Amino acid sequence: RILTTRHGTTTSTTQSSVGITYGYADADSFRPGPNTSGLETRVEQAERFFKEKLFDWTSDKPFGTLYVLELPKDHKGIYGYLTDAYTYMRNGWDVQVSATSTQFNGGSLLVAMVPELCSLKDREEFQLSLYPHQFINPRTNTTAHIQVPYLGVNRHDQGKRHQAWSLVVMVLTPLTTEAQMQSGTVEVYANIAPTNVFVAGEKPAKQ
Amino acid sequence: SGNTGSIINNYYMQQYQNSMDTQLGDNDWFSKLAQSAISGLFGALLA
Amino acid sequence: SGNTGSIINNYYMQQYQNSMDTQLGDNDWFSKLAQSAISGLFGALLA
Amino acid sequence: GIIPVACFDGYGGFQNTDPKTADPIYGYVYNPSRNDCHGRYSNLLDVAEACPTFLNFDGKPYVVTKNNGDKVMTCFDVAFTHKVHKNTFLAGLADYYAQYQGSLNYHFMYTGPTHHKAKFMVAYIPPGIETDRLPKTPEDAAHCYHSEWDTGLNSQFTFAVPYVSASDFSYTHTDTPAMATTNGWVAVFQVTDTHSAEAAVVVSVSAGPDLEFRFPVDPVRQ
Amino acid sequence: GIIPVACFDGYGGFQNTDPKTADPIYGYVYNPSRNDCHGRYSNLLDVAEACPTFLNFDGKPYVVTKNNGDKVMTCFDVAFTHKVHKNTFLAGLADYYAQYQGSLNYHFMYTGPTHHKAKFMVAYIPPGIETDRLPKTPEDAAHCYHSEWDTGLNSQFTFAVPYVSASDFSYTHTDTPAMATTNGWVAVFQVTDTHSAEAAVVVSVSAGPDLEFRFPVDPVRQ
Amino acid sequence: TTSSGEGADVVTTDPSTHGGAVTEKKRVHTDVAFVMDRFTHVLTNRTAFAVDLMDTNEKTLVGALLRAATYYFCDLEIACLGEHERVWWQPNGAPRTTTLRDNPMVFSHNNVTRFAVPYTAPHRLLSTRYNGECKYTQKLPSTFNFGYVTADKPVDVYYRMKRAELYCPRPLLPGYDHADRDRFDSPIG
């Protein structure tokens, strides 16, 4: 089940892939709108992988433990420059999550993308599968690969400020290590890249 | 369309009764998602 | 014409509802003026 | 010359569900184009089918595998008001609609270690007329419409629960006086009683292809 | 035999914007012919496009060229409520309409002596998310969507201000709580700082080809 | 886009000059025939009155846009409100009388009285302003009206311009004053 995803010069092989999970649309497809008057310009270089640790995942953590990750997040790359140079901006995310572990470990993650969450009520977690999602079972895959189009009330999300997508990872079942190999902690990384970025309304350079 | 219906038709012009839509030129998902389902039994069915 | 509209039509005859117009026989300007505008860039455009 | 007409009593009162539309104020508004606005769903049962949601087993969706006998990991009603369904999207959708028919689907995803192995069976018990019971061993549940699966490379197992009832539709809400279920039980036996140790089976539910709600209602809660 | 009919509640109240027309009194009036009555305008945006009106720079439409540094002859919001637009026909027309979209046009007519020469640049600053700023030198404003012109035989220069915003339409009136503009600034730098002496640049504004107002409103003033 | 401005030639450049396309919009709410066609409030608690159309408040949409035009043509629709039995309407040029008979008349229905007044004034066009020897180095004549309504009891009155045709544009001004702040800043619901 090998799968190799490249964006820009960056690549990401994975041999435990269970397949891409498209959310809400088979493919992101921008169309020009009245609101930018055609001044918008696509930028090739923004579309690259960048990665960040989410959490160590121990057996100590019970059901329903959450780890949200607001997107876009602050970043040192070109994408983090465009939030400073250009005001209005548009992108559709492509996200991997990886929780490498011995297959003798037992447990499961529910990684999912929630559009525009302000808060997530305690009762509400069971419903979380309505959102685009995949499961991380150590006995099977160690890699999830969600892919979503830009979503929002506005065709161009304001730079910074509003965050359309948030990457939530829930501990669907507690980790178990009956082999007692330790193991123990299982680090969970994410490997995220923008797709089909567009920018409009350049603003004066800092300072 | 929706919970509306009459043998006749609305007295006022469509321009007055409802906001007009505009194409992006000078869609449904969960139907397709539900139709993507594989009810076919996995493995070698027998008997 | 104007903010009026119905699938049907006005019950009374046009002679009763509105004053009839008369031709001077036994027009619009600012449309033309706005259409006279020259958006074409002046001088030798380059790049 | 005036057209005769006769206004009637009992007609023309305000109705919150009437087909007829209201008289317009503004005209010629043009809404912004919604082209390429992804994710629209035209019917709630579609999202009910494509998006399974987890059951409430004492606050935790999974059932733990156990060493002591018992063997009945769960034994819950096929009724939307039951506490197990309380977090599910279907119970929340059918909290409003008055009646239904058609099969449910239950997804069982094993989650334990790859070396750990287990065998399970689920059984659907038709409504009684049952003095209790319900059967507490797999040998007893074998007689019922059941299915049985062992863990392997393919973790998930989808058991479909048939709609068997005397009436073409059955109430979603449970009537206050009842000493027995009107839609029947379902139970999820483990079948070997030697498990060192723990393991877990995530459980979820989603509407079947043929399920159908009818009559919206807006009950006062509580 | 009488036709049944049901009068409804909530209908038939007096409405000041209703499509339906009133019952006639007189008939067969014949209005005098209006042939060869010149100057009719069928739409207000036409007169808004063909007839630019002057801006209010402290009571005087022109900006004076100046010797001391500064260089920012003007730096005003692209918003109709701004004091600069206060005398303009567009601010007075959009005082009524609730929303708009589309580009504005600003005309800059140099008025100084034929031997006097100058160079200017205008720049459009997108809405922020700006801690201020705004840039006070041309080198700083160069990064922004700008244009630059020097005086010559052809005096007038027409700079078009793009409609760049997240929403398809944007309010004409400014909401009471705001610490920053929602439609962005525009600024008109001189670019040499040696001008003996005076000179002046008349400024005016007129709606662009694609500008569009929507929703008439009649706000109570004050 | 340099061009001589002295000739007062029309110039309208789209952002295309900077590479941004802009499709033409077909505006409808800016249209005269659509905007002017509304029941503007004009006057309160008044019995007899001339149906002069300049009685409209100048801050209202219809009145302001009406004063944005020098000449105008309109069929009219009057709508009285408030308790009254009936409303008479004398066509333009009819002699004034304290009593009325046989002149066109409308009884109220649920304290509302709507009816359509045909354009009546002899002039081929009315005007919002009239230079009658009012020369200055720094009022409209009575013939400019649609009639003369009288009500049995004092009533609120509404006018609704129909088939409106405005001629020869005149300035619009915003009604609001900016006070100390150069940006007016107003509340929005």
Added chain:
Amino acid sequence: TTSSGEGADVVTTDPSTHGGAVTEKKRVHTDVAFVMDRFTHVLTNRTAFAVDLMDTNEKTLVGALLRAATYYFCDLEIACLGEHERVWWQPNGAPRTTTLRDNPMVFSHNNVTRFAVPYTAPHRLLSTRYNGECKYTQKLPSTFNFGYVTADKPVDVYYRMKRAELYCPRPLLPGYDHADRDRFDSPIG
């Protein structure tokens, strides 16, 4: 019907696996356009109010299903009740004023006032929830509304979604609590 669950592939098996046929049903009452189209009660004894559609009670059918969706599009129909002479309606983005004139207005007929409000908000879609820097490790902006109604006297209010289009599903929850008994058990007429 074993299948990998990690890929979150949709799976829907009918009882055919056990030899029982099940014909597809063509559900209509589950349909969005049909369900959302009703006069949900929203608020009582209130004069002026914004026509924010999130004022709907969350336990009502329309409000709950409305919160089951992240984005939505609706023409609207308002129906006021209770004694009042008239109801004004300011379109979205119009400045607030204590007095009102010439703004669209409807007199009551038998103490009921129904009228259709066109979708007005500039955004191509509204949303029931909006992540405006509300990050957390554990309110919607004013532009999201259909207008601003004011009544002459306080009135009950109803909203009726029209041409409803819900986007991006969100969780529904039952309102009832089971208390001591795991099965909720409720009375039926």
